[PDB]
Amino acid sequence: TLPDPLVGADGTRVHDRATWQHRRRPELLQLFAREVYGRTPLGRPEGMVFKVTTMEHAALGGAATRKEVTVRFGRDPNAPSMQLLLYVPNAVIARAERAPVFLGLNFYGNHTVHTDPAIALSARWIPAEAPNGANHRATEAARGSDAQKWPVEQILARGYAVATVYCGDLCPDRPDGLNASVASWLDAAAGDQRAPDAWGAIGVWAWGLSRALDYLETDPLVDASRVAVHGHSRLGKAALWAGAQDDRFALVISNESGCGGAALSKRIHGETVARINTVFPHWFARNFRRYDDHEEALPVDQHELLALVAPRPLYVASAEDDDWADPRGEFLAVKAAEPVFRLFGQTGPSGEDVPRVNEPSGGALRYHIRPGPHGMTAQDWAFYLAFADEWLKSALPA
Ligand SMILES: [Mg+2]
């Protein structure tokens, strides 16, 4: 039985957009921060520094300008940082127009998104599942190892820049990764044990996406008011929480984010709260473990996270064989968020059950399910590019 996003904490119904934006959104943001992801202790830190470390105007055979940028989270050179890779379509640059941007984290390092041998090899720890790693470090054989999830040439040809950062720059994806992470520094606690409401990996990854947007606001080649934040799987959980917390993001894409992402936790289907917290104890707040085998006690569900994106366009997608993510739960979260989108004059999927494969449904709130297993495929991206053409903030209001 789902909590109603349009009923406030005190039981009063939300009938208008101002009550939604100024009362209900803060209530939900605080519930997710306290009970699920942990508190984001601050947004933009003081003294952010942006260093363009490499710049190539004829990358990908002339199709793109490629920039690598160190985004340092404080002015002291000792402060933590992350490494942003940006490809910008040269057709757009050449016209003296700013490009819109797709921004998302990657799993195994910037060098894995494209074979491009000029990308810096990540020097950070990488997980054992990363293809062609050696002792948790990047190798030359890992270049372009994750390119199937990143159709860079097509995204550029459709007029969009591609920006990415390795999630492990922000928090390495290992159960002890928080002690190396941005959280070991921002949270800024003297003691050792993280607090019950302290953020975990998903919060730190989401924060990094907002810091990447801070960089994009300074880059004269891109339109930082037209940034689509996207993610696959655990990085799509991060993309949703980033897009919910930071309304500067113009469009949000959740590709198979599943449990603690788009899927309703109260369905108890596929991955559950207990399973995700037991296997990935660093991903959420310790407070989320209260709901292990007790999803009925959750004061929110993920449809309210989706609702926190409204009125901005939101795309949630699933894979047909990906039972662990609970595709029906991802779809039903979209349906239960739709009333908030409708309050803003937007339309969601028609249909009461999961659509047929490869048949997207919805307006600015959209869903598709594609054949096959968990992944992010060219078919997913084809649909996302069409959505961004239609619903991403325009270059005009002139
Ligand atoms: Mg589930």
Author numbering: 35 to 432
What text appears in the publication on this structure?
The enzymes are α/β-hydrolases with a catalytic triad typical of esterases. The targets, exhibiting sequence identities as low as 25%, were biochemically characterized using a range of model substrates, and the three-dimensional structures were solved for two of the enzymes.
Reg2 packs against the face of the main β-sheet, extends across an α-helix (α5 in OtCE15A and α4 in SuCE15C), and packs against Reg1 forming a contiguous unit between the two regions. Reg3 is a 15-residue hydrophilic loop found between, and packing against, the last β-strand of the main sheet and an α-helix (α9 and α8 in OtCE15A and SuCE15C, respectively). The tryptophan residue in StGE2 (Trp310) found hydrogen bonding to the 2-OH of the ligand is conserved in the bacterial structures (Trp358 in OtCE15A, Trp348 in SuCE15C, and Trp334 in MZ003), whereas Glu267 in StGE2 which hydrogen bonds with both 2-OH and the anomeric hydroxyl group (in β configuration) is not conserved (Arg303 in SuCE15C, Val313 in OtCE15A, and Ser289 in MZ0003).
